Design a protein around this motif. Structure first.
Motif, PDB file in Angstrom:
ATOM      1  N   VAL A  61     -28.971  31.276  78.766  1.00  0.00           N
ATOM      2  CA  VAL A  61     -30.385  31.090  78.405  1.00  0.00           C
ATOM      3  C   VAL A  61     -30.901  32.373  77.778  1.00  0.00           C
ATOM      4  O   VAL A  61     -31.526  32.365  76.685  1.00  0.00           O
ATOM      5  CB  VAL A  61     -31.215  30.745  79.641  1.00  0.00           C
ATOM      6  CG1 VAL A  61     -32.688  30.548  79.297  1.00  0.00           C
ATOM      7  CG2 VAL A  61     -30.629  29.491  80.320  1.00  0.00           C
ATOM      8  N   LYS A  62     -30.606  33.490  78.431  1.00  0.00           N
ATOM      9  CA  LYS A  62     -31.091  34.789  77.971  1.00  0.00           C
ATOM     10  C   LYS A  62     -30.540  35.167  76.615  1.00  0.00           C
ATOM     11  O   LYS A  62     -31.348  35.552  75.748  1.00  0.00           O
ATOM     12  CB  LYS A  62     -30.789  35.915  78.968  1.00  0.00           C
ATOM     13  CG  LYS A  62     -31.519  35.745  80.310  1.00  0.00           C
ATOM     14  CD  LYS A  62     -31.180  36.832  81.326  1.00  0.00           C
ATOM     15  CE  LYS A  62     -31.256  38.232  80.731  1.00  0.00           C
ATOM     16  NZ  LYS A  62     -30.800  39.254  81.743  1.00  0.00           N
ATOM     17  N   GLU A  63     -29.222  35.025  76.428  1.00  0.00           N
ATOM     18  CA  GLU A  63     -28.564  35.427  75.168  1.00  0.00           C
ATOM     19  C   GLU A  63     -29.215  34.672  74.030  1.00  0.00           C
ATOM     20  O   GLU A  63     -29.504  35.240  72.960  1.00  0.00           O
ATOM     21  CB  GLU A  63     -27.060  35.086  75.179  1.00  0.00           C
ATOM     22  CG  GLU A  63     -26.228  35.993  76.049  1.00  0.00           C
ATOM     23  CD  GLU A  63     -24.756  35.557  76.097  1.00  0.00           C
ATOM     24  OE1 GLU A  63     -24.456  34.378  75.765  1.00  0.00           O
ATOM     25  OE2 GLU A  63     -23.911  36.397  76.481  1.00  0.00           O
ATOM     26  N   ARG A  64     -29.423  33.379  74.261  1.00  0.00           N
ATOM     27  CA  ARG A  64     -29.937  32.519  73.189  1.00  0.00           C
ATOM     28  C   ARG A  64     -31.410  32.770  72.918  1.00  0.00           C
ATOM     29  O   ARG A  64     -31.829  32.842  71.744  1.00  0.00           O
ATOM     30  CB  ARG A  64     -29.698  31.056  73.536  1.00  0.00           C
ATOM     31  CG  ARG A  64     -28.188  30.749  73.475  1.00  0.00           C
ATOM     32  CD  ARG A  64     -27.963  29.263  73.774  1.00  0.00           C
ATOM     33  NE  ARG A  64     -26.546  28.969  73.539  1.00  0.00           N
ATOM     34  CZ  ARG A  64     -26.045  27.749  73.338  1.00  0.00           C
ATOM     35  NH1 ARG A  64     -26.847  26.697  73.355  1.00  0.00           N
ATOM     36  NH2 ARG A  64     -24.733  27.590  73.108  1.00  0.00           N
ATOM     37  N   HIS A  65     -32.216  32.900  73.958  1.00  0.00           N
ATOM     38  CA  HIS A  65     -33.600  33.270  73.720  1.00  0.00           C
ATOM     39  C   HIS A  65     -33.758  34.603  72.990  1.00  0.00           C
ATOM     40  O   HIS A  65     -34.561  34.711  72.063  1.00  0.00           O
ATOM     41  CB  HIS A  65     -34.388  33.327  75.039  1.00  0.00           C
ATOM     42  CG  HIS A  65     -35.740  33.914  74.853  1.00  0.00           C
ATOM     43  ND1 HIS A  65     -36.753  33.238  74.205  1.00  0.00           N
ATOM     44  CD2 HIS A  65     -36.234  35.135  75.184  1.00  0.00           C
ATOM     45  CE1 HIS A  65     -37.832  34.008  74.174  1.00  0.00           C
ATOM     46  NE2 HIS A  65     -37.537  35.165  74.754  1.00  0.00           N
ATOM     47  N   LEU A  66     -32.988  35.607  73.379  1.00  0.00           N
ATOM     48  CA  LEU A  66     -33.148  36.928  72.772  1.00  0.00           C
ATOM     49  C   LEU A  66     -32.746  36.915  71.290  1.00  0.00           C
ATOM     50  O   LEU A  66     -33.387  37.560  70.456  1.00  0.00           O
ATOM     51  CB  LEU A  66     -32.372  37.990  73.547  1.00  0.00           C
ATOM     52  CG  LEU A  66     -32.948  38.168  74.970  1.00  0.00           C
ATOM     53  CD1 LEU A  66     -32.030  39.111  75.718  1.00  0.00           C
ATOM     54  CD2 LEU A  66     -34.354  38.763  74.899  1.00  0.00           C
ATOM     55  N   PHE A  67     -31.681  36.183  70.970  1.00  0.00           N
ATOM     56  CA  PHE A  67     -31.251  36.060  69.573  1.00  0.00           C
ATOM     57  C   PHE A  67     -32.328  35.317  68.798  1.00  0.00           C
ATOM     58  O   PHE A  67     -32.689  35.721  67.685  1.00  0.00           O
ATOM     59  CB  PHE A  67     -29.921  35.280  69.525  1.00  0.00           C
ATOM     60  CG  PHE A  67     -29.265  35.241  68.159  1.00  0.00           C
ATOM     61  CD1 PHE A  67     -29.120  36.400  67.392  1.00  0.00           C
ATOM     62  CD2 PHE A  67     -28.728  34.053  67.672  1.00  0.00           C
ATOM     63  CE1 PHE A  67     -28.448  36.384  66.171  1.00  0.00           C
ATOM     64  CE2 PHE A  67     -28.057  34.028  66.431  1.00  0.00           C
ATOM     65  CZ  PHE A  67     -27.905  35.187  65.686  1.00  0.00           C
ATOM     66  N   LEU A  68     -32.808  34.192  69.334  1.00  0.00           N
ATOM     67  CA  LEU A  68     -33.857  33.437  68.572  1.00  0.00           C
ATOM     68  C   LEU A  68     -35.087  34.300  68.363  1.00  0.00           C
ATOM     69  O   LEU A  68     -35.733  34.221  67.309  1.00  0.00           O
ATOM     70  CB  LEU A  68     -34.274  32.167  69.320  1.00  0.00           C
ATOM     71  CG  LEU A  68     -33.218  31.047  69.327  1.00  0.00           C
ATOM     72  CD1 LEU A  68     -33.823  29.893  70.121  1.00  0.00           C
ATOM     73  CD2 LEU A  68     -32.833  30.568  67.939  1.00  0.00           C
TER      74      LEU A  68
END
Length: 270
Positions: free
Chosen positions: A215-222
């Motif tokens: 969840v974190k990796e994807r939110h931070l990239f977006l």
């Protein structure tokens, strides 16, 4: 005695029983070492077949439930009849016993009290209460404490309403026993860092069934890309289920609109 027990031991091994696990439980192991397959074990295996444990499932069942040979077969039969009196079908009981191998080690009174607890604590319909424990039968065999504690965490610490909690837990029954630290960290990230309101989290409870790093990796990239748009009332909306469910390659191309190489590059700055 070891030589004469060898054929029985070999039979248990061929079934997939892991004797090294049973050996951690010294009285159960010492009983098994002294049982003969035809005289003592076979009638237990035939009962397990009758309630729906298939031959290729016995090894895993017997490895988990090291206590099964210490239960009286008459009592095991009575406990299955009790489950049937509560409207669990034959197919239901087969699934419950396989997924919660200790289930028939609990007395009639304890099973009744445990079912009553889930009815009272969660307030679901009779039917949805049966559906819940058919879906996660270990709810009936585990400690009830994490259930009580997590119900209060969701309401009093995380701010969900009672009806919202029912909605989430019927879809994801593991929420009832999930580690409290992990629930809190996930909630804090999704509600406070991603600024997603309770009512949206309620609609996508699988975020509590996802490892948080993802969840974190994807939110931070977006966020890095300017594409962290989680409000359904605005364009380019990305739902929480898209976010936690779609594989990396499609998330990158279809959602982040970036190459996997660039996602990999970004993750190295974390």
């Amino acid at each position: 005695d070891y030589v004469d027990h060898s054929e029985t031991l070999q039979k248990l091994v061929l079934l997939g029983v892991d004797l090294s696990k049973i050996e951690k439980h010294p009285e159960a192991a010492n009983l098994l070492l002294r049982l003969d397959f035809e005289k003592d074990i076979k009638q237990m295996l035939l009962f397990l077949k009758d309630v729906g444990i298939e031959d290729n499932q016995l090894g895993a069942f017997l490895t988990k439930n090291h206590a099964i040979f210490s239960e009286d077969l008459e009592n095991l039969k009575t406990r299955v009849a009790y489950l049937h009196s509560k409207n669990f079908s034959k197919a239901d009981v087969a699934q419950m016993v396989r997924k919660a191998p200790f289930l028939l080690n609990f007395s009639v009174e304890r099973l009744d009290n445990r079912l009553g607890f889930f009815q009272k604590e969660l307030e679901l319909s009779v039917k949805k209460t049966r559906d819940l424990v058919v879906r996660l039968p270990r709810l009936l065999t585990g400690s009830l404490e994490p259930v009580k504690e997590n119900m209060k965490v969701y309401r009093l610490e995380l701010g969900f309403k009672h009806n919202e909690i029912q909605h989430m837990i019927t879809r994801i029954p593991k929420m009832l026993t999930a580690n409290k630290m992990k629930l809190t960290e996930t909630f804090d990230f999704v509600h406070n860092v991603m600024s997603i309101p309770h009512h949206i989290i309620v609609k996508f409870p699988q975020v509590f069934n996802t490892r948080l790093f993802k969840v974190k990796e994807r939110h931070l990239f977006l966020t890095y890309l300017g594409r962290a748009q989680y409000d359904p009332a605005k364009p380019n909306y990305i739902s929480l289920d898209k976010l936690v469910s779609i594989p990396d390659e499609i998330f990158c191309e279809e959602i982040a609109k970036a190459s996997v190489q660039d996602f990999e590059k970004f993750l190295k700055t974390l």
